[PDB]
């Protein structure tokens, strides 16, 4: 993160839950995420992703959230890479 000019990355955190997923596909414009059920897919733009979308690969874990009612059309927002539990 470092410090300096501080762009627009931080926002609000209180009415937004956290979720995880797995990079299903990585293109040269947008990517997809496979949920735990492996029945649906999330849509996130490179502009929405804050980190190293170019470094991301297939199988890696990521953090995202949802903010829509019941529907087939779902998309993520403010996506960012995140680590998980493992032998350190």
mmCIF file of N, CA, C and O in Angstrom:
data_model
loop_
_atom_site.group_PDB
_atom_site.id
_atom_site.type_symbol
_atom_site.label_atom_id
_atom_site.label_comp_id
_atom_site.label_asym_id
_atom_site.label_seq_id
_atom_site.Cartn_x
_atom_site.Cartn_y
_atom_site.Cartn_z
ATOM 1 N N UNK A 1 0.806 -1.207 0.000
ATOM 2 C CA UNK A 1 0.000 0.000 0.000
ATOM 3 C C UNK A 1 0.842 1.260 0.000
ATOM 4 O O UNK A 1 0.594 2.180 -0.780
ATOM 5 N N UNK A 2 1.838 1.304 0.879
ATOM 6 C CA UNK A 2 2.717 2.464 0.981
ATOM 7 C C UNK A 2 1.917 3.726 1.291
ATOM 8 O O UNK A 2 0.718 3.662 1.567
ATOM 9 N N UNK A 3 2.588 4.872 1.244
ATOM 10 C CA UNK A 3 1.942 6.149 1.525
ATOM 11 C C UNK A 3 2.366 7.206 0.510
ATOM 12 O O UNK A 3 3.372 7.050 -0.182
ATOM 13 N N UNK A 4 1.592 8.283 0.428
ATOM 14 C CA UNK A 4 1.902 9.351 -0.504
ATOM 15 C C UNK A 4 0.687 10.188 -0.854
ATOM 16 O O UNK A 4 0.055 10.773 0.027
ATOM 17 N N UNK A 5 0.362 10.247 -2.140
ATOM 18 C CA UNK A 5 -0.783 11.024 -2.604
ATOM 19 C C UNK A 5 -2.092 10.383 -2.157
ATOM 20 O O UNK A 5 -3.086 11.069 -1.927
ATOM 21 N N UNK A 6 -2.084 9.058 -2.036
ATOM 22 C CA UNK A 6 -3.271 8.321 -1.620
ATOM 23 C C UNK A 6 -4.423 8.553 -2.594
ATOM 24 O O UNK A 6 -5.139 9.550 -2.500
ATOM 25 N N UNK A 7 -4.595 7.624 -3.529
ATOM 26 C CA UNK A 7 -5.660 7.744 -4.507
ATOM 27 C C UNK A 7 -7.022 7.420 -3.924
ATOM 28 O O UNK A 7 -7.266 7.645 -2.738
ATOM 29 N N UNK A 8 -7.912 6.895 -4.759
ATOM 30 C CA UNK A 8 -9.257 6.544 -4.320
ATOM 31 C C UNK A 8 -9.431 5.029 -4.258
ATOM 32 O O UNK A 8 -9.987 4.419 -5.172
ATOM 33 N N UNK A 9 -8.951 4.427 -3.175
ATOM 34 C CA UNK A 9 -9.052 2.984 -2.995
ATOM 35 C C UNK A 9 -9.944 2.645 -1.804
ATOM 36 O O UNK A 9 -10.730 1.697 -1.853
ATOM 37 N N UNK A 10 -9.821 3.428 -0.738
ATOM 38 C CA UNK A 10 -10.619 3.213 0.464
ATOM 39 C C UNK A 10 -11.997 3.853 0.325
ATOM 40 O O UNK A 10 -12.151 4.887 -0.325
ATOM 41 N N UNK A 11 -12.997 3.231 0.941
ATOM 42 C CA UNK A 11 -14.349 3.755 0.876
ATOM 43 C C UNK A 11 -15.119 3.539 2.165
ATOM 44 O O UNK A 11 -14.761 4.087 3.207
ATOM 45 N N UNK A 12 -16.178 2.740 2.092
ATOM 46 C CA UNK A 12 -17.001 2.455 3.262
ATOM 47 C C UNK A 12 -16.990 0.964 3.586
ATOM 48 O O UNK A 12 -16.951 0.125 2.687
ATOM 49 N N UNK A 13 -17.021 0.644 4.875
ATOM 50 C CA UNK A 13 -17.013 -0.746 5.316
ATOM 51 C C UNK A 13 -17.909 -0.933 6.537
ATOM 52 O O UNK A 13 -17.519 -0.616 7.661
ATOM 53 N N UNK A 14 -19.111 -1.452 6.309
ATOM 54 C CA UNK A 14 -20.064 -1.679 7.389
ATOM 55 C C UNK A 14 -21.262 -2.485 6.896
ATOM 56 O O UNK A 14 -21.757 -3.370 7.591
ATOM 57 N N UNK A 15 -21.723 -2.169 5.690
ATOM 58 C CA UNK A 15 -22.864 -2.863 5.103
ATOM 59 C C UNK A 15 -22.437 -3.676 3.884
ATOM 60 O O UNK A 15 -23.180 -3.787 2.908
ATOM 61 N N UNK A 16 -21.238 -4.244 3.949
ATOM 62 C CA UNK A 16 -20.711 -5.045 2.850
ATOM 63 C C UNK A 16 -19.970 -6.270 3.378
ATOM 64 O O UNK A 16 -18.944 -6.149 4.049
ATOM 65 N N UNK A 17 -20.496 -7.450 3.068
ATOM 66 C CA UNK A 17 -19.886 -8.699 3.508
ATOM 67 C C UNK A 17 -18.675 -9.046 2.648
ATOM 68 O O UNK A 17 -18.409 -8.389 1.641
ATOM 69 N N UNK A 18 -17.947 -10.083 3.050
ATOM 70 C CA UNK A 18 -16.766 -10.517 2.314
ATOM 71 C C UNK A 18 -16.965 -11.917 1.741
ATOM 72 O O UNK A 18 -17.648 -12.752 2.336
ATOM 73 N N UNK A 19 -16.366 -12.167 0.582
ATOM 74 C CA UNK A 19 -16.479 -13.466 -0.074
ATOM 75 C C UNK A 19 -15.177 -13.837 -0.775
ATOM 76 O O UNK A 19 -14.299 -12.993 -0.964
ATOM 77 N N UNK A 20 -15.059 -15.101 -1.162
ATOM 78 C CA UNK A 20 -13.864 -15.584 -1.846
ATOM 79 C C UNK A 20 -14.233 -16.347 -3.115
ATOM 80 O O UNK A 20 -15.386 -16.732 -3.306
ATOM 81 N N UNK A 21 -13.245 -16.563 -3.977
ATOM 82 C CA UNK A 21 -13.486 -17.281 -5.216
ATOM 83 C C UNK A 21 -12.205 -17.772 -5.860
ATOM 84 O O UNK A 21 -11.128 -17.671 -5.271
ATOM 85 N N UNK A 22 -12.321 -18.308 -7.070
ATOM 86 C CA UNK A 22 -11.163 -18.820 -7.793
ATOM 87 C C UNK A 22 -11.181 -18.361 -9.247
ATOM 88 O O UNK A 22 -12.178 -18.528 -9.951
ATOM 89 N N UNK A 23 -10.072 -17.781 -9.692
ATOM 90 C CA UNK A 23 -9.958 -17.298 -11.064
ATOM 91 C C UNK A 23 -10.304 -18.395 -12.063
ATOM 92 O O UNK A 23 -9.539 -19.340 -12.253
ATOM 93 N N UNK A 24 -11.464 -18.264 -12.700
ATOM 94 C CA UNK A 24 -11.911 -19.244 -13.683
ATOM 95 C C UNK A 24 -11.261 -18.997 -15.039
ATOM 96 O O UNK A 24 -10.831 -19.933 -15.714
ATOM 97 N N UNK A 25 -11.192 -17.729 -15.436
ATOM 98 C CA UNK A 25 -10.597 -17.359 -16.713
ATOM 99 C C UNK A 25 -10.018 -15.950 -16.662
ATOM 100 O O UNK A 25 -10.574 -15.063 -16.014
ATOM 101 N N UNK A 26 -8.900 -15.749 -17.351
ATOM 102 C CA UNK A 26 -8.246 -14.446 -17.385
ATOM 103 C C UNK A 26 -8.011 -13.992 -18.821
ATOM 104 O O UNK A 26 -7.247 -14.610 -19.563
ATOM 105 N N UNK A 27 -8.672 -12.906 -19.209
ATOM 106 C CA UNK A 27 -8.534 -12.366 -20.556
ATOM 107 C C UNK A 27 -7.749 -11.058 -20.540
ATOM 108 O O UNK A 27 -7.243 -10.640 -19.498
ATOM 109 N N UNK A 28 -7.655 -10.415 -21.698
ATOM 110 C CA UNK A 28 -6.934 -9.153 -21.816
ATOM 111 C C UNK A 28 -7.896 -7.970 -21.761
ATOM 112 O O UNK A 28 -7.839 -7.071 -22.598
ATOM 113 N N UNK A 29 -8.781 -7.980 -20.768
ATOM 114 C CA UNK A 29 -9.757 -6.909 -20.603
ATOM 115 C C UNK A 29 -10.621 -7.146 -19.368
ATOM 116 O O UNK A 29 -10.945 -6.209 -18.636
ATOM 117 N N UNK A 30 -10.989 -8.402 -19.141
ATOM 118 C CA UNK A 30 -11.814 -8.761 -17.994
ATOM 119 C C UNK A 30 -11.562 -10.207 -17.574
ATOM 120 O O UNK A 30 -10.975 -10.988 -18.321
ATOM 121 N N UNK A 31 -12.008 -10.553 -16.370
ATOM 122 C CA UNK A 31 -11.820 -11.902 -15.869
ATOM 123 C C UNK A 31 -13.076 -12.465 -15.234
ATOM 124 O O UNK A 31 -14.039 -11.736 -14.996
ATOM 125 N N UNK A 32 -13.068 -13.765 -14.962
ATOM 126 C CA UNK A 32 -14.217 -14.426 -14.354
ATOM 127 C C UNK A 32 -13.815 -15.138 -13.065
ATOM 128 O O UNK A 32 -12.653 -15.504 -12.882
ATOM 129 N N UNK A 33 -14.783 -15.331 -12.175
ATOM 130 C CA UNK A 33 -14.531 -15.998 -10.905
ATOM 131 C C UNK A 33 -15.516 -17.141 -10.680
ATOM 132 O O UNK A 33 -16.726 -16.967 -10.824
ATOM 133 N N UNK A 34 -14.990 -18.308 -10.323
ATOM 134 C CA UNK A 34 -15.823 -19.478 -10.077
ATOM 135 C C UNK A 34 -16.117 -19.633 -8.588
ATOM 136 O O UNK A 34 -15.209 -19.825 -7.779
ATOM 137 N N UNK A 35 -17.395 -19.546 -8.231
ATOM 138 C CA UNK A 35 -17.811 -19.674 -6.840
ATOM 139 C C UNK A 35 -17.475 -21.056 -6.290
ATOM 140 O O UNK A 35 -16.853 -21.870 -6.971
ATOM 141 N N UNK A 36 -17.891 -21.313 -5.055
ATOM 142 C CA UNK A 36 -17.637 -22.598 -4.415
ATOM 143 C C UNK A 36 -18.557 -23.680 -4.972
ATOM 144 O O UNK A 36 -18.214 -24.861 -4.968
ATOM 145 N N UNK A 37 -19.726 -23.267 -5.449
ATOM 146 C CA UNK A 37 -20.696 -24.202 -6.007
ATOM 147 C C UNK A 37 -20.327 -24.577 -7.440
ATOM 148 O O UNK A 37 -20.714 -25.637 -7.936
ATOM 149 N N UNK A 38 -19.574 -23.703 -8.100
ATOM 150 C CA UNK A 38 -19.152 -23.943 -9.476
ATOM 151 C C UNK A 38 -20.356 -24.015 -10.409
ATOM 152 O O UNK A 38 -20.349 -24.757 -11.391
ATOM 153 N N UNK A 39 -21.388 -23.238 -10.097
ATOM 154 C CA UNK A 39 -22.600 -23.213 -10.908
ATOM 155 C C UNK A 39 -22.781 -21.852 -11.572
ATOM 156 O O UNK A 39 -23.386 -21.745 -12.639
ATOM 157 N N UNK A 40 -22.253 -20.813 -10.934
ATOM 158 C CA UNK A 40 -22.355 -19.458 -11.461
ATOM 159 C C UNK A 40 -20.974 -18.829 -11.619
ATOM 160 O O UNK A 40 -19.975 -19.383 -11.163
ATOM 161 N N UNK A 41 -20.927 -17.669 -12.267
ATOM 162 C CA UNK A 41 -19.669 -16.966 -12.484
ATOM 163 C C UNK A 41 -19.829 -15.471 -12.227
ATOM 164 O O UNK A 41 -20.877 -14.891 -12.510
ATOM 165 N N UNK A 42 -18.783 -14.854 -11.688
ATOM 166 C CA UNK A 42 -18.807 -13.426 -11.394
ATOM 167 C C UNK A 42 -18.115 -12.627 -12.492
ATOM 168 O O UNK A 42 -17.165 -13.101 -13.116
ATOM 169 N N UNK A 43 -18.596 -11.409 -12.722
ATOM 170 C CA UNK A 43 -18.023 -10.541 -13.745
ATOM 171 C C UNK A 43 -17.388 -9.305 -13.115
ATOM 172 O O UNK A 43 -18.059 -8.525 -12.438
ATOM 173 N N UNK A 44 -16.091 -9.132 -13.344
ATOM 174 C CA UNK A 44 -15.363 -7.991 -12.799
ATOM 175 C C UNK A 44 -14.451 -7.373 -13.854
ATOM 176 O O UNK A 44 -13.727 -8.080 -14.556
ATOM 177 N N UNK A 45 -14.491 -6.049 -13.961
ATOM 178 C CA UNK A 45 -13.669 -5.334 -14.930
ATOM 179 C C UNK A 45 -12.281 -5.051 -14.362
ATOM 180 O O UNK A 45 -12.104 -4.963 -13.147
ATOM 181 N N UNK A 46 -11.302 -4.910 -15.248
ATOM 182 C CA UNK A 46 -9.931 -4.642 -14.835
ATOM 183 C C UNK A 46 -9.847 -3.342 -14.040
ATOM 184 O O UNK A 46 -8.975 -3.178 -13.187
ATOM 185 N N UNK A 47 -10.760 -2.420 -14.327
ATOM 186 C CA UNK A 47 -10.788 -1.133 -13.642
ATOM 187 C C UNK A 47 -11.303 -1.288 -12.214
ATOM 188 O O UNK A 47 -10.942 -0.516 -11.327
ATOM 189 N N UNK A 48 -12.149 -2.293 -12.003
ATOM 190 C CA UNK A 48 -12.714 -2.548 -10.684
ATOM 191 C C UNK A 48 -11.705 -3.267 -9.791
ATOM 192 O O UNK A 48 -11.755 -3.155 -8.565
ATOM 193 N N UNK A 49 -10.793 -4.004 -10.413
ATOM 194 C CA UNK A 49 -9.774 -4.742 -9.676
ATOM 195 C C UNK A 49 -8.642 -3.817 -9.237
ATOM 196 O O UNK A 49 -8.050 -3.113 -10.054
ATOM 197 N N UNK A 50 -8.347 -3.826 -7.942
ATOM 198 C CA UNK A 50 -7.290 -2.985 -7.393
ATOM 199 C C UNK A 50 -6.132 -3.835 -6.879
ATOM 200 O O UNK A 50 -6.153 -4.316 -5.747
ATOM 201 N N UNK A 51 -5.120 -4.016 -7.722
ATOM 202 C CA UNK A 51 -3.965 -4.807 -7.338
ATOM 203 C C UNK A 51 -3.101 -5.187 -8.523
ATOM 204 O O UNK A 51 -2.634 -4.320 -9.263
ATOM 205 N N UNK A 52 -2.885 -6.484 -8.705
ATOM 206 C CA UNK A 52 -2.069 -6.977 -9.809
ATOM 207 C C UNK A 52 -2.853 -7.967 -10.664
ATOM 208 O O UNK A 52 -2.511 -9.148 -10.738
ATOM 209 N N UNK A 53 -3.909 -7.479 -11.308
ATOM 210 C CA UNK A 53 -4.742 -8.322 -12.158
ATOM 211 C C UNK A 53 -3.911 -9.007 -13.238
ATOM 212 O O UNK A 53 -4.267 -10.080 -13.722
ATOM 213 N N UNK A 54 -2.801 -8.379 -13.609
ATOM 214 C CA UNK A 54 -1.916 -8.928 -14.630
ATOM 215 C C UNK A 54 -1.102 -10.092 -14.075
ATOM 216 O O UNK A 54 -0.706 -10.994 -14.813
ATOM 217 N N UNK A 55 -0.855 -10.065 -12.769
ATOM 218 C CA UNK A 55 -0.082 -11.115 -12.115
ATOM 219 C C UNK A 55 -0.972 -12.305 -11.766
ATOM 220 O O UNK A 55 -0.503 -13.442 -11.685
ATOM 221 N N UNK A 56 -2.256 -12.036 -11.561
ATOM 222 C CA UNK A 56 -3.213 -13.084 -11.220
ATOM 223 C C UNK A 56 -3.147 -14.228 -12.226
ATOM 224 O O UNK A 56 -2.781 -14.028 -13.383
ATOM 225 N N UNK A 57 -3.510 -15.426 -11.777
ATOM 226 C CA UNK A 57 -3.494 -16.601 -12.640
ATOM 227 C C UNK A 57 -4.733 -17.461 -12.409
ATOM 228 O O UNK A 57 -5.637 -17.082 -11.665
ATOM 229 N N UNK A 58 -4.767 -18.623 -13.054
ATOM 230 C CA UNK A 58 -5.894 -19.539 -12.920
ATOM 231 C C UNK A 58 -5.737 -20.420 -11.684
ATOM 232 O O UNK A 58 -4.777 -21.180 -11.569
ATOM 233 N N UNK A 59 -6.688 -20.311 -10.761
ATOM 234 C CA UNK A 59 -6.638 -21.104 -9.547
ATOM 235 C C UNK A 59 -6.385 -20.261 -8.313
ATOM 236 O O UNK A 59 -6.728 -20.658 -7.199
ATOM 237 N N UNK A 60 -5.779 -19.094 -8.511
ATOM 238 C CA UNK A 60 -5.479 -18.192 -7.405
ATOM 239 C C UNK A 60 -6.760 -17.736 -6.713
ATOM 240 O O UNK A 60 -7.839 -17.765 -7.302
ATOM 241 N N UNK A 61 -6.631 -17.316 -5.458
ATOM 242 C CA UNK A 61 -7.778 -16.853 -4.685
ATOM 243 C C UNK A 61 -7.887 -15.333 -4.733
ATOM 244 O O UNK A 61 -6.884 -14.632 -4.870
ATOM 245 N N UNK A 62 -9.112 -14.828 -4.618
ATOM 246 C CA UNK A 62 -9.353 -13.391 -4.647
ATOM 247 C C UNK A 62 -10.494 -13.005 -3.713
ATOM 248 O O UNK A 62 -11.259 -13.860 -3.269
ATOM 249 N N UNK A 63 -10.602 -11.713 -3.421
ATOM 250 C CA UNK A 63 -11.651 -11.215 -2.539
ATOM 251 C C UNK A 63 -12.608 -10.299 -3.296
ATOM 252 O O UNK A 63 -12.182 -9.419 -4.043
ATOM 253 N N UNK A 64 -13.903 -10.514 -3.097
ATOM 254 C CA UNK A 64 -14.923 -9.710 -3.763
ATOM 255 C C UNK A 64 -16.180 -9.605 -2.904
ATOM 256 O O UNK A 64 -16.244 -10.158 -1.806
ATOM 257 N N UNK A 65 -17.178 -8.890 -3.413
ATOM 258 C CA UNK A 65 -18.433 -8.709 -2.694
ATOM 259 C C UNK A 65 -19.599 -8.558 -3.665
ATOM 260 O O UNK A 65 -19.402 -8.346 -4.862
ATOM 261 N N UNK A 66 -20.815 -8.670 -3.141
ATOM 262 C CA UNK A 66 -22.016 -8.546 -3.961
ATOM 263 C C UNK A 66 -22.957 -7.489 -3.393
ATOM 264 O O UNK A 66 -22.953 -7.222 -2.191
ATOM 265 N N UNK A 67 -23.763 -6.891 -4.265
ATOM 266 C CA UNK A 67 -24.709 -5.862 -3.850
ATOM 267 C C UNK A 67 -25.897 -5.799 -4.805
ATOM 268 O O UNK A 67 -26.214 -4.742 -5.351
ATOM 269 N N UNK A 68 -26.550 -6.939 -5.001
ATOM 270 C CA UNK A 68 -27.705 -7.016 -5.889
ATOM 271 C C UNK A 68 -28.709 -8.048 -5.386
ATOM 272 O O UNK A 68 -28.361 -8.946 -4.620
ATOM 273 N N UNK A 69 -29.958 -7.915 -5.825
ATOM 274 C CA UNK A 69 -30.993 -8.843 -5.410
ATOM 275 C C UNK A 69 -30.828 -10.214 -6.037
ATOM 276 O O UNK A 69 -29.723 -10.604 -6.414
ATOM 277 N N UNK A 70 -31.930 -10.947 -6.149
ATOM 278 C CA UNK A 70 -31.905 -12.282 -6.734
ATOM 279 C C UNK A 70 -31.976 -12.210 -8.256
ATOM 280 O O UNK A 70 -32.994 -11.815 -8.822
ATOM 281 N N UNK A 71 -30.887 -12.597 -8.915
ATOM 282 C CA UNK A 71 -30.848 -12.570 -10.365
ATOM 283 C C UNK A 71 -29.660 -13.325 -10.928
ATOM 284 O O UNK A 71 -28.678 -13.562 -10.226
ATOM 285 N N UNK A 72 -29.751 -13.706 -12.198
ATOM 286 C CA UNK A 72 -28.675 -14.442 -12.854
ATOM 287 C C UNK A 72 -27.509 -13.517 -13.186
ATOM 288 O O UNK A 72 -26.359 -13.951 -13.261
ATOM 289 N N UNK A 73 -27.812 -12.239 -13.387
ATOM 290 C CA UNK A 73 -26.791 -11.251 -13.710
ATOM 291 C C UNK A 73 -26.132 -10.713 -12.443
ATOM 292 O O UNK A 73 -26.697 -9.871 -11.746
ATOM 293 N N UNK A 74 -24.932 -11.206 -12.151
ATOM 294 C CA UNK A 74 -24.195 -10.774 -10.970
ATOM 295 C C UNK A 74 -22.791 -10.309 -11.338
ATOM 296 O O UNK A 74 -22.160 -10.860 -12.240
ATOM 297 N N UNK A 75 -22.306 -9.292 -10.633
ATOM 298 C CA UNK A 75 -20.976 -8.750 -10.887
ATOM 299 C C UNK A 75 -20.295 -8.348 -9.582
ATOM 300 O O UNK A 75 -20.955 -7.970 -8.616
ATOM 301 N N UNK A 76 -18.968 -8.435 -9.564
ATOM 302 C CA UNK A 76 -18.196 -8.079 -8.380
ATOM 303 C C UNK A 76 -17.805 -6.605 -8.402
ATOM 304 O O UNK A 76 -17.995 -5.919 -9.405
ATOM 305 N N UNK A 77 -17.260 -6.126 -7.289
ATOM 306 C CA UNK A 77 -16.843 -4.733 -7.182
ATOM 307 C C UNK A 77 -15.681 -4.586 -6.204
ATOM 308 O O UNK A 77 -15.638 -5.248 -5.168
ATOM 309 N N UNK A 78 -14.737 -3.714 -6.544
ATOM 310 C CA UNK A 78 -13.573 -3.477 -5.698
ATOM 311 C C UNK A 78 -12.861 -4.787 -5.374
ATOM 312 O O UNK A 78 -12.576 -5.079 -4.212
ATOM 313 N N UNK A 79 -12.578 -5.573 -6.408
ATOM 314 C CA UNK A 79 -11.897 -6.851 -6.231
ATOM 315 C C UNK A 79 -10.422 -6.648 -5.902
ATOM 316 O O UNK A 79 -9.789 -5.715 -6.396
ATOM 317 N N UNK A 80 -9.882 -7.528 -5.067
ATOM 318 C CA UNK A 80 -8.480 -7.445 -4.671
ATOM 319 C C UNK A 80 -7.959 -8.808 -4.227
ATOM 320 O O UNK A 80 -8.688 -9.599 -3.626
ATOM 321 N N UNK A 81 -6.692 -9.078 -4.525
ATOM 322 C CA UNK A 81 -6.071 -10.344 -4.155
ATOM 323 C C UNK A 81 -5.996 -10.491 -2.638
ATOM 324 O O UNK A 81 -5.876 -9.503 -1.914
ATOM 325 N N UNK A 82 -6.066 -11.730 -2.164
ATOM 326 C CA UNK A 82 -6.005 -12.006 -0.734
ATOM 327 C C UNK A 82 -5.384 -13.372 -0.464
ATOM 328 O O UNK A 82 -5.586 -14.318 -1.225
ATOM 329 N N UNK A 83 -4.630 -13.469 0.627
ATOM 330 C CA UNK A 83 -3.976 -14.719 0.996
ATOM 331 C C UNK A 83 -4.886 -15.566 1.881
ATOM 332 O O UNK A 83 -5.873 -15.074 2.426
ATOM 333 N N UNK A 84 -4.546 -16.844 2.016
ATOM 334 C CA UNK A 84 -5.341 -17.740 2.835
ATOM 335 C C UNK A 84 -4.498 -18.532 3.815
ATOM 336 O O UNK A 84 -3.282 -18.361 3.900
ATOM 337 N N UNK A 85 -5.150 -19.422 4.579
ATOM 338 C CA UNK A 85 -4.472 -20.259 5.572
ATOM 339 C C UNK A 85 -3.582 -21.317 4.928
ATOM 340 O O UNK A 85 -3.998 -22.010 3.998
ATOM 341 N N UNK A 86 -2.357 -21.437 5.428
ATOM 342 C CA UNK A 86 -1.407 -22.409 4.899
ATOM 343 C C UNK A 86 -0.135 -22.439 5.740
ATOM 344 O O UNK A 86 0.131 -21.522 6.517
ATOM 345 N N UNK A 87 0.650 -23.500 5.577
ATOM 346 C CA UNK A 87 1.894 -23.652 6.323
ATOM 347 C C UNK A 87 2.824 -22.468 6.076
ATOM 348 O O UNK A 87 3.306 -22.265 4.963
ATOM 349 N N UNK A 88 3.073 -21.690 7.125
ATOM 350 C CA UNK A 88 3.944 -20.536 7.002
ATOM 351 C C UNK A 88 5.317 -20.780 7.596
ATOM 352 O O UNK A 88 5.453 -20.976 8.803
#
